[PDB]
Amino acid sequence: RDPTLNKTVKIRQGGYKGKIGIVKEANGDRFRVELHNPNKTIPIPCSF
Amino acid sequence: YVDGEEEETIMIAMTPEDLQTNDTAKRIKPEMSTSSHHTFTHCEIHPSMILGVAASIIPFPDHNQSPRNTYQSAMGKQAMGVFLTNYNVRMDTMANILYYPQKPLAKTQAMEYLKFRELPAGQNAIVAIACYSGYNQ
Amino acid sequence: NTPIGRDGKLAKPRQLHNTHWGLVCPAETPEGQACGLVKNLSLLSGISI
Amino acid sequence: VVASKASSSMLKIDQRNKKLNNRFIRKAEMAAVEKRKLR
Amino acid sequence: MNAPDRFELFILPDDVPKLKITPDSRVPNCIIIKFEREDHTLANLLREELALYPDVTFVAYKVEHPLFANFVMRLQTEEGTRPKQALERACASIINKLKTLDHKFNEEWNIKN
Amino acid sequence: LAIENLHPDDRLLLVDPSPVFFLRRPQYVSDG
Amino acid sequence: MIIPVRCFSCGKVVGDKWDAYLRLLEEGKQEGDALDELKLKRYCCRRMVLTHVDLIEKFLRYNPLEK
Amino acid sequence: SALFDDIFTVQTVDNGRYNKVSRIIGISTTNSAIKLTLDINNEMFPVSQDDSLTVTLANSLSLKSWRPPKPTDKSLADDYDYVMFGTVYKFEEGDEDKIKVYVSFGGLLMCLEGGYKSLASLKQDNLYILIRR
Amino acid sequence: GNLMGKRVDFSARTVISGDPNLELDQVGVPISIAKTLSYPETVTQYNIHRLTEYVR
Amino acid sequence: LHKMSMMAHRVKVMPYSTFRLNLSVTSPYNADFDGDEMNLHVPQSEETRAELSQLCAVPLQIVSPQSNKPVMGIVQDTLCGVRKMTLRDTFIEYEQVMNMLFWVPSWDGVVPQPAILKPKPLWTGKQLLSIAIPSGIHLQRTDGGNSLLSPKDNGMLIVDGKVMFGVVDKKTVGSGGGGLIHTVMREKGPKICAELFGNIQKVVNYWLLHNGFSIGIGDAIADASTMKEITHAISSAKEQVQEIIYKAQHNELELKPGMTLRESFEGEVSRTLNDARDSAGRSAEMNLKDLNNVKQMVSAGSKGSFINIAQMSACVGQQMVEGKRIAFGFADRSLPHFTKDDFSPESKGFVENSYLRGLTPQEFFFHAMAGREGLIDTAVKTAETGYIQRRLVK
Amino acid sequence: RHGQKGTIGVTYRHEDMPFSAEGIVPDLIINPHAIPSRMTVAHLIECLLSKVGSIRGYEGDATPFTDLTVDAVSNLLRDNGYQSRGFEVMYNGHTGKKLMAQVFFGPTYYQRLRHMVDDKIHARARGPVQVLTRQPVEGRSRDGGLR
Amino acid sequence: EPKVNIINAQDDEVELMLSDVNLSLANSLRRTMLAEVPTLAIDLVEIKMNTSVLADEFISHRLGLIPLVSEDVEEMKYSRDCTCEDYCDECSVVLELSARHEGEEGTTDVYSSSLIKVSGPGNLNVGEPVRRDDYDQGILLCKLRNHQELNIRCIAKKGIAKEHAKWSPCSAIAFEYDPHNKLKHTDFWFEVDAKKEWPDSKYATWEEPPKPGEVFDYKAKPNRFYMTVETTGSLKANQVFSRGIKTLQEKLANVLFELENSR
RNA sequence: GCUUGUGCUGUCUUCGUCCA
Ligand SMILES: [Mg+2]
Ligand SMILES: [Zn+2]
Ligand SMILES: [Zn+2]
C-alpha cells in the first residue's frame, strides 16, 4: 500500500509533461498512471 | 391505383415520351415493332420509383452490376451519420454520431423525400485510384 | 416478411418475380438464410385498408 | 418560434434556388426533348 | 490501443544512436549507414548529391517499413577516397547550396517588396 | 432588367474568353 | 454539425468564411460565384463549404439542461 | 580484339507495338546471304530505311562490378555511336554453310545469319555489338 | 460439441491487413496480443540472463 | 476446406491492432482485406513448436498434393507491375537501378552491366527481374508456336537464372504448374522459393511505386467506329432472331432431335444472342490500345477477363434465369409494358446496352432477377456441399 | 455507395502522399484492381460528376434512367480546364518526380461502417470456464476462447 | 550557382521559380516546409465549464486547429526540453476564453477573437490568434443559446506537423516542372491525340515549346521548378521559406556533427 | 502504528459479419 493510489497526479517531466492523471498501480517506483484524455495507461517513475 | 392482379389487364407506357411515336454515349430504347400500333392505358410516373429506401441512395444504379446494388443496400444501413437530432436527451444502448456529416455531391431525386440532405451519413473524400505503394491491394 | 421458414427451403419463393415490379424493391434483400424471403416496399407502394 | 438569422437566410436561399431550379431544369428538359424529337 | 506515440517519429531515445556505420565486406571500400528518426527528406537529398560525385561508385537507400522511422544507406567509393569523407563533403556542399539559395531569396524578396 | 432584356446582338457580344438539366442548385430544407 | 476549421485535404482555414458565404448567397450570387468571391480555388476546399450541413441549428432548438 | 565487322543496309524498320524499340533487317553489302535482325532503342539511335550501318562484334572493349567510366580511360566504344552488351543463348550449327547466332541484349534480340567462315569465332558466352553511322 | 471440437486457450482473433514488406512465412502481431499470449520457457544456463531480464 | 488453411508462420511484433500477411499467402487462405478475420494458435511445448516449424510451415506448403502444382503465386499489383516492367521498351537509369538492386535482400553486391552502354547507360526490366531469380534455373515455354527471335515477345526462356526473352506474367510467376515457382521449389527447396517471393515482390513494388498505374472512366470508352460496328452486329443478330421467329411461326423450323419445337426455338435464339454478345465483345476488345488500363490488367492476368470488357464496353447480353430466358410471369408476357405473345430479344431479357451506356428499366429489372438467382444459388448449395465434405472426411 | 468496401491498410502523412500540380493530395487511395472484375462503372461516373459539381458549385443529378451521358459531363469538365476523362498528372511524394502514369482523381462519397478493429480484437491465455464441461466460455465480452 | 526568381509576392502566398538546383533539393524543401517548420498551437485545454451542445473533445479539437502567431517561436523552447516545473513562460502561452449568452432569446456566436492572451514569453511576438484584419471576427468556434456558457483555459506549445497536422504552417504547396514534357517523365494517356486532349500548364508560356524537327535530348535533367507556398497566417510566406531552408541546414549539420563525433 | 480486498448465470429469440 502506497499513499498515492487513486489520487490525482500531474506529470512534470518527460514526453507527457503537464498532463493530469490518476495513479492506478504502484509497485516499485514505476507508478501506472491513466491519462484523462488519451484512453491509455502509461508507466512512469515516481520522480516525474 | 392498380394492384398486381389488375396489372395483368393494362398496357403501361414507361415514359410520357413513349406515348408519341446514332450517339455512342446515349442508351438505346426498345423498338417494340411487333405491333403496328399501340393503345396505352396507363403511364409510369417515374421509373426510378420501383426502388426502395436503401436502393434510392445509390447514384447511377443502372450502371452497376445488380449484386453490388444489393451489397450497397445492405451496407448503407451500417453507415454512421446522425440518426436523430435529439441524441443528447436519449439514453440508448449504443449510438454513433459523425463529427462532420456532409451531403453528397452526386444525389438522386428520391433522396429529397428520405431527408438524406438534412441527416447525411457520410463524407465527400478526395479519392485517387492508383497502385501507390502496395498497401491498398 | 414471408413466413416459409428454413426447413424445406426452395429457390422459387426466394426468387424475384415479374409481378414484384413496382411493389417491392428488386435490390434490397438480406444476405444468407433470409435471402428473398424478407422484402422491402417500393417507394410509391401502398397497402389496401 | 423566434428563428435565427442564419436559418431565415437559408430559407430565403432555399426558396430562390427552388424557383430557379424549377425554371431552368424544366426549360433544359424541354430543349432536350424537342431536340430528340426533331431527330 | 496499439497506436504508437506520434513523437516517436522524430524524438531519439537515449539508448538509440542517431547513426551506426558498419562495413560491407562483399565489395571493397563500402559501408552501411543506419539513420535513426529520419525519412526520405534527408535520404533522397544525400543520395542524389552523392550520385554526382566522380569518386562515388555506388549510393542507394531504402526505407524498410513505413511504420518505422529509419532508413539504411549503402555507399561505395573509389580506392583513394573513404566513404565517410564523401558523406561529409556531400553534407557540407548541400549546406553551402542552401546558404546561397537563402541569400538570393532574401535579396529578391527585399527587391520586390 | 437582366440578360433577357438585353438585345440579342448585344447578347452575342457576350462571348466567354447553356444550363444542363443534371446540375441542380443546392438546397437545405428539401421537401416531403 | 458546425463548419470545420480546416479543409480535410490541404488544411486551408475555411472556418472563417461560413457567414460570408451565407451573406453572399443572400445577396443573390450563385454558389460557384460565391465560392470564387471567397477565394476558394481548389475544389477540395470548395467541397468543404459546398457540402456542409449545419446541424447545430437543430441541436440549439432544445431547451438547455442547466441554468 | 574484334570478332566480326561488316556494313549493312536496312531493308525494313518495324516499330510494331513499341514506341522506343524498332526491329531492323539488314544484309551485308560485301557478302550476300549474311542477314542481320536487331532490336535497337529508337530514342538514342534512330535509324531510317536504306541507311548504312557499320556493325562490329567483340567479346571485350579493352585495347566484375560495373562502374561509370572515368573520362581518362579509353576503350573500343569511343569510336562508335551505339554499344550494347548481351549473352549468346543459341549457336545453331545448321546446314552446310548456314549458321545462326542468337544474342539477347537484356531482352533485345539479335539473329545473325551467315556462313561458318565468317561466324566461326562468334562461339562465345557474351558479345558486344558496336554500331557506327 | 465438446469432444470432436471444443473451445481452447492460448488463441487470438482480429482483422487482417496486407503488408508488402513482410516475408512469406511471417505474420505481424499486435503488441497487446503479444502481451496477452505467453509461452512457458524452461530456465536453463543458456537463457537464464535473458529470462530474468524478462522477469524484471 | 484443406490443409493449407492452417499454416505455421513466424511472429513479428508490430504496432496497430491487425494481423499482417504477405499477399502471396492470401490465396491458400482464400482471404482478402475487406473485413476478414483470422485465428492464431500458440504452441506451449518444445515438441509442439518443432512439429509446427518442421511440418506445417508456410514454405513447405507451396506445392499442394491435390493437383501437383503450386498454390501460391505473384498476384494483384505485383503481377501487373512485373508485366509492365518486363516489357521490351522498359529502360531504367543508373540511380534507380542502384536503388532497386539495394532493395533485393539476396543481391550479392555486384551490379550487372547495362544492356546499352552508349550513348547513355540503360538497364532493362528483364535484368532487374533476373537479379531476383536464383542462379542455376532453366525454364523454357513456347506460346503460339513462336520462334527463338520472339517477334511478339511471347514465350519464355530463362538460362542460368537470366531472362532472355518473354514478358513475365501469370503464365510464368502464377500458381500454374511448370512455372518459375514450381521449378525453383523443385530445384532449390522451399526456403529459396520463399525468398524468391519476397525478392520479386520488393523489386516490382519499388518500380511500380515510382512508375504508377491507374484506371479511369475513359478506359471503358470505345471509339465511334467500334461502336458503329457493335451496333451493326447487334442489329444484324436481332434481324436474325426475327427471321427465326417468323420461321417458327410458319412451321418452317428444323427440329433438333430429342427436343420439341419450342425447346429447339429457344435454344437457337439463345445461341444467336450469345454469338452476338461474343462478336460485339471481340470487336470491343480488339479496338483497345496497349495503353488501355483494363487491357493491361486483363493481359497481366491479375484481375478481369474478356467478358468484363465485353459487358462494360459493348453489351451486357442475355439474362438467364434457371438456364432459360426470362419467363412470362404475367399473362403471356414478362412485364406489363410489353404486349402479349412477344418473343423479341428485348421482351425476354436481352440487355443490348453496356454498363457505360446505362440500362433501361426493363433491362434493370431482368438483370436484378438474374443476380437474385445467383445469390440464391450460392446460399442454397453451400449447405449441401458442406454436408458432402463432412461425409467424405468421416 | 457502390458495394466497394474495404479496410485501411496504412496511413501516410501529407508530404508522403502523391500530389497534383496545384498541390491537391487525396484523402484516400484505392487500388485499380477493385474496378474491372466488379464492373462498378457508376463509381467512376459518380467521381467525374462530383468533380464537375465541386468545380462549378452545383449538385450533380444521379437519378437512374435519365438522359445523362458521360460525354456531356466530359465536355463540362473539359470546359473548366481539366482533362475530360478525369485524369491528372501526379508527382511522387518521396522524390518529387512525375509519375509515368496519370491518375484518376476526384471526390467520391464514402461512409464509415460500424465494424472497427478495436471492437473485434480478442486474445485469451487463460480465464473463466464453463461449469458443466470445464471448457473455455464463449464470447469476447466474457473473455472467452476460440473454437 | 542556385538562383531564385519571384513571380508574385504576398503576406500569405509567394509564387517563385527555382533554377540550377536538383529535383531532390526542391522536393526536400517542399517536404520540410510541409512537415518540419515549427509553429505554435494549442495543445492542452482545461475546461472549467461547458454547457453548450458540443462535446468537450469536439471543442478541444476545434481549438487545436486555430492558427496562432508564431513569428518568434524560434526563441521559445520545446516543452520536453524545458527544465521548469509544469508550464512556464519560456515554453508555453496561456489563452483564456469565456463566453455566455445574455438574454432569453437569440443565439451567440463564439469566435476565435474572443481568445485572450494571459501569459507568455516576455516581448516575443507569439500567442495571439491570427486575424486577417482589425474588424475580422475569426474562426467560428461554437454557438450558445440562453443559459449556456463556455469557460476554458488553453495552453499553446511549440511543435511540428510530424506530430500533428495542427502545427503545419502551410496549407498546400503547388509544385511543377517541365510543362512541355521535354524530359518525357510522363506518358500521356489519350484516345485520339494526346496534344489536344490535355490542358496546357499555367507555366507553358514560360518555356519554349519543342521544335517539330527536334530529337529527344537524353542528356537533359530537370532544371527549373515552379512552386507556390500558401500559409495559414501563422507565418508569412518568406518566413516559411527561410525557416525551411534553416531547418534543412540544421538537419545536415546534425548529421555532420554525428559523423565527426563518431571517430 | 498503520497496512488492499481477489469474480459470474443459464435458455431461447432476433439482427448482423466473412466465406460459400
Ligand atoms: Mg472478404
Ligand atoms: Zn483544400
Ligand atoms: Zn518551461
CATH classification at residue E4: 3.30.1360.10
Ligand 2 geometric centre to CA of L164 (Å)? 17
Cα dihedral D1→D4→D9→D13 (10° resolution): -60
Query: Among B25, B70, D24, J316, which Cα is nearest to K66's?
Result: B25
Q: How near does any CA of chain I get to the CA of E111, in Å? A: 51
Q: Considering only CA atoms, name the residue closest to the C1' of nucleotide M18.
A: J36
Q: What is the DSSP string of J192-228?
A: HHHHHHHHHHHHHHHHHHHH-----GGGG---HHHHH
Tell me the pairing of strands J19-21 and I11-18. parallel
**Distances in Å between the alpha carbon of J356 and those of B85, E32, J316, J319, K69?**
39, 54, 10, 18, 9
Indicate the length of chain H as a whole number: 133
Beta strands in I1-56 (DSSP E): 11-18, 26-30
β-partners of residue K20 are K90
| Interface touch K118/E1, C-beta < 8 Å | yes
Distance, Å, A2 CA → M2 C1': 12
L179 upstream amide cis, omega within 30 of 0: no
Determine the number of helices (DSSP H) and then strands (DSSP E) in chain A.
0, 4
Q: Quickly count: other Cβ atoms within 10 Å of residue D19's Cβ.
A: 11
Angle, alpha carbons B124-B126-B128 (nearest 5°) = 140
DSSP conformation class of B67: H
Q: Which chains touch G (3 or more CB pairs under 8 A)?
A: B, D, F, K, L
- Min Cα distance E57 → chain H (Å) is 6
Q: Which amino acid is at L19?
A: S
G22 touches chain L (CB under 8 A): no
In sequence order, which ranges of J31-71 are alpha helices (DSSP H)? 46-55
CATH architecture type of domain G1-66: Orthogonal Bundle (1.10)
Return the bridge partners of I14, or none.
J38
How far apart are alpha carbons L224 and L108 in whole angstroms? 52
Using the CA of C32, give the nucleotide whose C1' is nearest: M20
The sign of the CA dihedral J170, J176, J178, J183 is: positive
CA L43 / C1′ M6 distance in Å: 40
The answer to whether the CB atoms of I15 and K117 lie below 8 A apart is yes
Domains belonging to chain L, first-starting first, are 1-38+166-263 (3.30.1360.10), 39-165 (2.170.120.12)
Q: Which stretches of J277-344 are assigned E, i.e. beta strand?
A: 317-318
- Cβ-based contacts of D4 with chain L (< 8 Å): 106-107
Residue whose Cα is closest to the C1' of M15: C30
CB neighbour class for B137 (10 Å; exposed up to 12, middle 13-18, buried from 19): buried
| Cα→Cα distances B96→A37, B82, J352, K112, Å | 19, 8, 44, 10
How close is the Cα of K63 to the center of ligand 3, in Å? 60
Parent domain of J115: 78-211
F17 touches chain G (CB under 8 A): no
Left if phi > 0, otherwise alpha if psi is -120 to 50, otherwise beta: which for J46? alpha
Distance A33 CA to M5 C1' (A): 21
Sign, CA dihedral H71-H72-H74-H78, equals positive
Chain G residues lying within 8 Å of L107, measured CB to CB: 60
Per-residue burial over H116-125, b if 16 or more Cβ lie within 10 Å, else e, is eebbeebebe
Q: Give me the resolution in angstroms, 1 decimal.
A: 3.4
Distance from C-alpha of J301 to C-alpha of J290, rounded to nearest angstrom: 15
Q: Dig out the grid coordinates for L135 from the structure.
A: 474588424
Q: Is K33 on the interface with L (CB under 8 A)?
A: no
Q: Among chain A residues 1 through 20, which have CB within 7 angstroms of nucleic chain M?
A: 1-2, 5
Whole-number Å distance, alpha carbon K8 to ligand 1 midpoint, is: 14
Q: H91: buried, middle or exposed (CB in 10 Å: 19+, 13-18, 0-12)?
A: middle
DSSP SS3 for H4: strand
Q: Quickly tell me which residue has 444467336 as its cell.
A: J272
Which candidate from E10, E18, E99 shows the least CB-CB separation from L162? E10
H or E stretch at L19: strand L13-19
Mark yes or no for CB contact G30/F25 under 8 Å.
Answer: yes
Rounded distance, CA F19 to CA K116, Å?
Answer: 44
Distance CA J4, CA J205 (A): 26
- Domain coverage including residue A8: 2-48
Chain K: nearest CA to G12, how far in angstroms? 11
Min Cα separation H44/chain L (Å): 7
CA pair distance I16, H61, nearest whole angstrom? 55
Residues written for chain L: 263
Q: Closest nucleotide to K143's CA, by C1' atom? A: M8
> CB of J153 within 8 Å of any CB in chain C?
no
Interval between CA K107 and ligand 2 midpoint (Å): 12
Rounded CA gap, D9 and D6, in Å?
5
Are L158 and L92 in contact by the 8 Å Cβ rule? The answer is no
Name the amino acid, one letter, at E32.
Answer: I
Q: Would the CB atoms of H44 and L215 count as touching at under 8 Å? A: no
Q: Does J121 touch chain H (CB under 8 A)?
A: yes
Q: Which residue has the cell 495503353?
A: J291
Interchain pair I10, J13: CB under 8 A: no
Round to whole Å and give the CA distance between J129 and J199.
9
Nucleotide nearest to K139 (CA to C1'): M8
Number of domains in chain H: 1
Nucleotide nearest to A4 (CA to C1'): M4
Question: Do you know the residue count of chain C?
Answer: 49
For residues J15 and E1, give the distance between their C-alpha atoms in angstroms, rounded to a whole number.
9
Ligand (nearest to CA of K5)? 1
At residue K38's C-alpha, the angle toward residues K33 and K39, to 5°, is 100
Q: Which domain holds residue E23?
A: 1-113
Q: Which bases on strand M have an atom closer than 7 Å to a protein beta carbon?
A: 3-4, 7-10, 15-20
L198 reaches K (C-beta below 8 A): yes
How was this one solved? cryo-EM
C16 is near strand M: CB distance < 7 Å: no
Subunits next to I (3 or more Cβ pairs <8 Å) are: B, E, J, K
| Run of H or E residues at H41 | strand H35-41
| Residue J35 approaches strand M within 7 Å at CB | yes
CB contact under 8 A, L253 and E95: yes
Which helix (H) or strand (E) segment holds residue H132: the answer is: strand H126-132
Domain count, chain E: 1
Tell if B78 CB is < 7 Å from nucleic strand M. Answer: yes
Nearest chain L alpha carbon to G67: L147
Handedness of CA J143, J145, J151, J152 (dihedral sign): negative
* Contacts with E111 (C-beta within 8 Å, 6 or more apart), sequence order: none
Task: Determine the Cα–Cα distance for residues J85 and C27; give it in Å rounded to an integer.
Answer: 42
**CB–CB of E60/E47 below 8 Å?**
yes
In total, chain G counts a number of residues equal to 67
As given in the structure block, the three cell numbers for residue H78 are: 569511343
Range of the domain at H50: 1-133
